[PDB]
């Protein structure tokens, strides 16, 4: 809790298994298999009440998780692949937080 | 020391347009990322659009993309929201706010120094 990214605090997830992402292309699949452990397995997010819906929560979660990971060598290909796997984890995280919020 | 106050608003017909402004005090408006939020009756403030300090990057909630345009005039210490193709769902109090930290985000917690707000009503 209470994590700071880019000078803003109040960010909050537990580690998740990184799954394989299936890109529909042999080279991308092989590159992902080679590099997937360099990518995050925990996502940064903010409380669900700070968003209107899942899409906006997930947008921040993807953006900030990747920024935190890349500012703390990643190419543009790495960023694009991180966007795919981190989006899935952020969706999972949103469902966890949403269920807790509606209780 | 940068504080904010919205102007513009009022009534607009469905499909019409209007422009909101957000005037800033102090000397460093041009160093702040900025955002617009809106609060519909009985709801909390939720993201509409944001713009970086330089004006070079902007972001929008999906339901306003292509209809609303955020902009700023650093020389005049003001940010704008041009609202086109207004829909009944757009009726709300609109607030401007100063960005916290270096990254524009969509969360309500990414901004502070909220203006007092201005009202937009789509006619019915």
Author numbering:
A (entry chain A): 118 to 129, 131 to 190, 197 to 227
B (entry chain B): 1 to 124
The authors write:
Prion disease is caused by the misfolding of normal prion protein (PrPC) to its pathogenic isoform, termed PrPSc. The host-encoded PrPC is a cell surface glycosylphosphatidylinositol (GPI)-anchored glycoprotein containing a flexible N-terminal fragment and a well-folded α-helical C-terminus. We recently reported that an anti-PrP camelid heavy chain antibody or nanobody (Nb), namely Nb484, inhibits prion conversion in cultured mouse neuronal cells in a dose-dependent manner. To understand the structural basis of Nb484 mediated inhibition, here we report two new X-ray crystal structures of mouse (Mo) PrP•Nb484 complexes at pH 6.0 and pH 8.0 resolved with a resolution of 2.1 Å and 1.2 Å, respectively; and the crystal structure of the nanobody Nb484 alone (at 1.2 Å resolution).
The second complex was crystallized at pH 8.0 and determined to 1.2 Å resolution. Both structures contain residues from 118–226 and the average backbone root-mean-square distance between them is only 0.609 Å, indicating that both structures are almost identical. In both structures at different pH, Nb484 stabilizes residues 120–122 of MoPrP into a β-strand, termed β0, which folds into a three-stranded antiparallel β-sheet with β1 and β2. MoPrP(89–230) interacts with Nb484 through a discontinuous binding epitope comprising residues 123 and 125 of the β0-β1 loop; residue 128 of β1 strand; residues 164, 167, 168, and169 of the β2-α2 loop; and residues 173, 174, 177, 178, 182, 185 and 189 of the α2-helix. Remarkably, Nb484 binds to Y128 between G127 and M129, which leads to an extended β1 strand (residues 125–130). The β0 and β1 strands are connected with a defined loop, termed β0-β1 loop, which forms a 2:2 IP type β-hairpin between β0 and β1 strands. In this loop, Gly123 and Gly124 occupy a type I′ β-turn and are stabilized by H-bonds located between Val122 and Leu125. In addition, the formation of this β-hairpin exposes several backbone hydrogen donors and acceptors to solvent. Our findings suggest that the binding of Nb484 to this region not only stabilizes the PrP hydrophobic region, but also prevents the amyloid fiber formation. The MoPrP-Nb484 interactions also significantly stabilize the β2–α2 loop at the C-terminal domain, leading to a rigid β2–α2 loop.
